[PDB]
Amino acid sequence: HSHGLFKKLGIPGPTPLPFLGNILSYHKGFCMFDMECHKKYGKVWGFYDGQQPVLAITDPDMIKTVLVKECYSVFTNRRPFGPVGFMKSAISIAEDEEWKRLRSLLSPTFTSGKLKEMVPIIAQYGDVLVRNLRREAETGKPVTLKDVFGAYSMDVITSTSFGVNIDSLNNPQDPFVENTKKLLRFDFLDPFFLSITVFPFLIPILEVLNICVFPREVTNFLRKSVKRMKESRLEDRVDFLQLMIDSQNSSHKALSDLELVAQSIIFIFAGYETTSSVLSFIMYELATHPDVQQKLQEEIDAVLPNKAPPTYDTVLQMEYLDMVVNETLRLFPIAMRLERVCKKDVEINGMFIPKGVVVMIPSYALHRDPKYWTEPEKFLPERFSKKNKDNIDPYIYTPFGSGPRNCIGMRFALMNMKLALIRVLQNFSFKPCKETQIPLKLSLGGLLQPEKPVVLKVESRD
Amino acid sequence: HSHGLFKKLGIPGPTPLPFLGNILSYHKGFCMFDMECHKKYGKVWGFYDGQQPVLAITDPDMIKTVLVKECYSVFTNRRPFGPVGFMKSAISIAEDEEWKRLRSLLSPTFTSGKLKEMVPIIAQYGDVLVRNLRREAETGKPVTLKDVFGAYSMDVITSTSFGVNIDSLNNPQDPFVENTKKLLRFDFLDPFFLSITVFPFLIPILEVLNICVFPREVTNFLRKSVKRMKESRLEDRVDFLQLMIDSQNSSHKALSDLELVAQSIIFIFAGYETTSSVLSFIMYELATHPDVQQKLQEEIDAVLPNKAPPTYDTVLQMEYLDMVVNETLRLFPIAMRLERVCKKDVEINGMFIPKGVVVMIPSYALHRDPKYWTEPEKFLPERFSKKNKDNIDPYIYTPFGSGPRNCIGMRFALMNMKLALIRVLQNFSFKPCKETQIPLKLSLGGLLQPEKPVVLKVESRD
Ligand code: HEM
Ligand code: HEM
Ligand SMILES: CC(C)N[C@@H](CSC[C@H](Cc1ccccc1)NC(=O)OC(C)(C)C)C(=O)NCc1cccnc1
Ligand SMILES: CC(C)N[C@@H](CSC[C@H](Cc1ccccc1)NC(=O)OC(C)(C)C)C(=O)NCc1cccnc1
């Protein structure tokens, strides 16, 4: 059973039911379960996802050893979560030596250099986003942000990774738009993924029936799509695909054709719903904190007078904008948790850790700990002012994780989201509607997302 | 193992491999496997779908006992085929007493009476089909029949079962059109369904993970869609839904709300790809047999002079049209086989049949038997002339099965397909293109469908 393990080592936690372990306590979501545990049990605790032991840790020293010092030797991989098919070769899923080789063949894709190159592409779709917004702003109808930010996020994905150029909002039925919309963030508390936790032995079975968590058709579409573009650019700069094609010419072992496809898909999956979700959470805070929206709009006009177009350099110039983005990510860190599988009997910061345990960092709960954040629930961007940004522990605030396996798309994600904000706020202000949910409720599911979706009023600064 | 059963009873057949049984012999498809067996082995034979024994029978007496005389007592159900979820309640899947109750609450829906009522609806989409065809006939581009007949078939389904009215071809992106297109005939020789045959014990497992062969979203869409229409017509004639709603007012036990949904879905699944597939096979024969198309066009003009609109009565008037439809269904009976599970030790026409065996009628192969059809591969509509239609055994030619469990949608299916043909042939002629596959090859898969899809030239009789 292994349900005696934490009781032995002296670690506290909720008592597990047979077979289910502690999963019935997810009825209120990971976020509410994690805070409770931190409160009830202290700096460390333990629980069981079925029979799999999970050790939670909240001490910044312990957290650093795990994600940095002993990342290569001990805590290199994440927990498997379901049948993956050929997506086993995607960087975020791959393990150990395959992972290290993959992370290397793809890191130059995410340098500040290649990213400054991509700025003018992502900018062009700032414009598209505006026109589409004004069309809803010239017709005084409340607006669903995720719909319009999704269309933008999508637009940016297609171009920055394949060269394809569509305003998805107006071609909602373009093939390259349909498949991609199906690529939604996995709800790890829906019937299926729960069942996987009760029956992880079911995972092999499903794999032998080529059942996949990435719908077989979406993937089949993109593979040939990629294997077509591969053989249309070759032969006839500047997207993720080309960067990867260019890499399997001129670790090591180059990148396989199918390995290349899986990375294409993962970048899509990672960047789509996330970008659009964070952008929604930020407009929710700007509409319910009018000062902050006004202070930010003023800042944007000074750097970019005359609605001047944002550039890479003038984006990194804006401090309040960076403050606002970070404080949103504090209150809504959409990964919720960080996790590593401990692959060896180990002892770190004076605590034994037996093989196979899952080490977990409860990010959401640390972001709202009163022991590090005064008034943690209030939206106060000044926590991140260059005055106070020094009193913030990088192992307490980790919206992109930390260490060698942190978010590879971090710089890009922030740059994408900020370009969107600048062009939007150059043009509109955003006001609560009667139908706006104040104060926002987080979904009880396994996603950090709003219970009810965000709807606001949008007015032209003209 | 049970792999000794046929060897014992004195029945011949191919030797089964361990675990796989005879399935490796499906590499050429059910149709080619069935003919071979009939040839090699005679009037009866046996084989194993994994460990499940299947007895084939080709004697018309034996076939009648099975589908008619002993249908209620012995051969009431079909073989399960995969995880079905809530679609377990659909008539074609349900079993025994539930089946008999369902077949009864739905039979009045398929009377000649209700069907004559539906004629003017299905006719209106004959017109739509024309306009769309002429648009491709005024632009001399070869035409893919299944695309244009699919759009028609779809159009007819939506209206005859929910009142919805769209020209799907031009609204290819209407929600009510997207879901329905996913409802495609199951390929019982793709990786998944084969695996089910090797691991039928996997079926329970999949059911406990709410995995379904009817994609959970399509079904989720229609349920609420139906539960909306149910509560918009009620309260504010003339489709399958209303007929079923009217039935759960004024066997017995009425029809449950969820039972009603499953029938809605099955009619869609049954009528969509089938109608469009048969209609394609018929235009393939009319284009490669120009006499027959001309003789039929002449017949239509005499009954309906001046492109007069077809009616129920003038449709049943047309004999050559009926001949042509039937002879197509002979060469392409798209179910391929009929099957019943023997639920008891039984002895019929002097042959023992142990419990649990699957009794199978190899329709495709009987339709092409030289022992009943001279020149079986030739397309000769005169086999069905009212002169020779008496020399045809109803248990050899069974495109809709036979007995209490035969195709409930038969009259409707024929009437739909004939209305389509009349309106089309009143207006166009259909000629081979260079890119037409002559002679058509049947797919080696588990569907009766063309290897390559049918493309023809379409000319206005104007
Ligand atoms: C607001 C946007 C995003 C947020 C908040 C976010 C957050 C995270 C977090 C917390 C992790 C886990 C880090 C760890 O385990 O320590 C992660 C991993 C990852 N992210 Fe993101 N992410 C975002 C957008 C993106 C984008 C746009 C990409 C585009 C390529 C991307 C690619 C990845 C990859 C590939 C990994 C796994 C890396 C590895 O295992 O080596 N992410 N992300
Ligand atoms: C060209 C069109 C069609 C052909 C060739 C066809 C053929 C067949 C065949 C061979 C069977 C099995 C009969 C048996 O087991 O003896 C069947 C069953 C069935 N068909 Fe069709 N079919 C067609 C269209 C339709 C349509 C339009 C509907 C619309 C409602 C429909 C509804 C059903 C149902 C419900 C069953 C199962 C009945 C029961 O189990 O009681 N079919 N069909
Ligand atoms: C393979 C994929 C399905 N599983 C992850 C592996 S990476 C860790 C993720 C990151 C994440 C970030 C934001 C929102 C959701 C998830 N989940 C993580 O919280 O783990 C537990 C749920 C605690 C087990 C993946 O690759 N996701 C692609 C991606 C998405 C978003 C940002 N960056 C990358
Ligand atoms: C539940 C559904 C997935 N399975 C069938 C049960 S009915 C027997 C069918 C009929 C059929 C006709 C034409 C084309 C394909 C199938 N298959 C049959 O050949 O069985 C074996 C494959 C030999 C095992 C169902 O309900 N199909 C709805 C339907 C479709 C078409 C016509 N009428 C009804």
XYZ file of C-alpha atoms in Angstrom, chain B residues 122-123 125-127 129-130 133 145 149 152 156 275-287 292-293 296-301 304 308 310 315 318 320-329 379 413-430 456 461:
69
model
C -36.717 16.111 -47.937
C -37.834 17.518 -51.287
C -33.314 19.942 -50.043
C -33.445 18.283 -53.434
C -33.620 21.862 -54.716
C -28.654 20.112 -53.858
C -29.342 21.225 -57.448
C -24.437 21.144 -58.162
C -19.882 13.128 -54.974
C -24.142 14.075 -51.308
C -27.417 16.781 -48.922
C -31.942 15.855 -44.718
C -27.178 7.666 -47.592
C -24.268 9.588 -48.961
C -22.285 6.379 -49.601
C -24.993 4.565 -51.484
C -25.791 7.644 -53.505
C -22.132 7.761 -54.545
C -22.046 4.118 -55.565
C -25.156 4.673 -57.725
C -23.766 7.671 -59.571
C -20.593 5.644 -60.151
C -22.648 3.007 -61.951
C -24.751 5.480 -63.889
C -21.638 7.253 -65.207
C -28.828 3.008 -67.784
C -28.571 6.710 -66.940
C -33.625 6.273 -66.147
C -33.672 9.938 -67.205
C -36.289 9.066 -69.822
C -38.407 7.266 -67.201
C -38.243 10.264 -64.853
C -39.366 12.734 -67.550
C -42.543 13.986 -64.028
C -42.219 18.299 -62.344
C -41.304 14.250 -57.352
C -41.570 8.040 -56.497
C -40.758 4.420 -60.885
C -36.278 1.242 -63.359
C -35.239 3.644 -60.600
C -36.082 0.968 -58.036
C -34.216 -1.604 -60.169
C -31.103 0.575 -60.303
C -31.126 1.230 -56.542
C -31.466 -2.467 -55.737
C -28.742 -3.598 -58.128
C -26.331 -1.061 -56.609
C -27.189 -2.401 -53.145
C -23.921 -4.133 -63.098
C -33.484 5.370 -46.583
C -34.759 4.300 -50.013
C -37.170 7.242 -50.250
C -34.484 9.762 -49.302
C -32.016 8.327 -51.825
C -34.584 8.176 -54.635
C -35.817 11.736 -54.115
C -32.186 12.779 -54.452
C -31.680 10.837 -57.673
C -34.820 12.146 -59.368
C -34.054 15.824 -58.757
C -30.387 15.372 -59.723
C -31.067 13.448 -62.950
C -33.843 15.799 -63.963
C -31.051 18.347 -64.348
C -27.604 16.862 -64.987
C -25.762 14.071 -66.687
C -22.697 12.454 -65.174
C -17.189 12.625 -62.137
C -29.158 19.255 -69.340
